[PDB]
């Protein structure tokens, strides 16, 4: 279970983002460049109807491939339905829209084996305010792996 952005203005998360940091409940979800949930968000695209398209990069067949996940709005605020990366939900935890956004993905069937969270930033500075916000949010969650990236890796295909 989770603590979410219940006042989320979906339209204001539009545009460019970089993955600064990631955390997962299970080491195996992030423990290699090919791990199923090691994904790098490039862009969030709200639809006119309040759905969300997430553009990301993922090492696949020995290439940095572009993926688009379609996230459909639900009757619960800040919770979107997906069918991707063996996940079925996206939760937005916290954002100021202009600097940082924290979100998680999970399988509702097995959240403690599926839970992956990301710190997104608007610009490739090692955002210590963003990392601090992510730290505060992860305080609550049962995370056993935490990864961070340097400014340089944010602007690279699939973070080097
Ligand atoms: Pt909030």
Numbering used by the authors: 3 to 162
Text taken from the publication that reported this structure:
pmcβ-lactoglobulin is a whey carrier protein of 18.4 kDa. Due to its high water solubility, safe status, biodegradable nature, gel-forming ability, abundance, stability at an acidic pH, and stability against gastric pepsin, β-lactoglobulin can be considered a good protein for the preparation of micro- or nano-particles in the pharmaceutical and food industries, although it is one of the major allergens in cows’ milk. Since the protein binds anticancer Pt compounds, it can, in principle, be used as a nanocarrier with controlled release properties for these molecules. Spectroscopic and spectrometric measurements suggested that β-lactoglobulin can also bind oxaliplatin (OXA), a Pt-based anticancer agent that is approved for the treatment of colorectal cancer.
Analysis of the X-ray diffraction pattern indicated that β-lactoglobulin crystals grown under this condition belong to a new crystal form. The final structure contained two molecules in the asymmetric unit (molecules A and B hereafter) and was refined to an R-factor of 0.212 (R-free = 0.284) (see SI for further details). As expected on the basis of the statistical analysis carried out comparing the structures of the Pt-protein adducts with those of metal-free proteins, the overall conformation of β-lactoglobulin is not significantly affected by OXA binding. An inspection of the difference using Fourier and anomalous electron-density maps clearly reveals the presence of a peak due to the binding of a Pt-containing fragment close to the side chain of Met7 of molecule A, in agreement with what is observed in the structure of the adduct formed when crystals of the protein have been treated with CDDP. Access to the side chain of Met7 of molecule B is hampered by the crystal lattice. Mass spectrometry data suggest that OXA rapidly binds the protein via the coordination of a [Pt(DACH)]2+ fragment to a β-lactoglobulin residue side chain. Since the Pt binding to the Met side chain could be reversible, our data suggest that β-lactoglobulin could be used as a Pt-based drug delivery system.
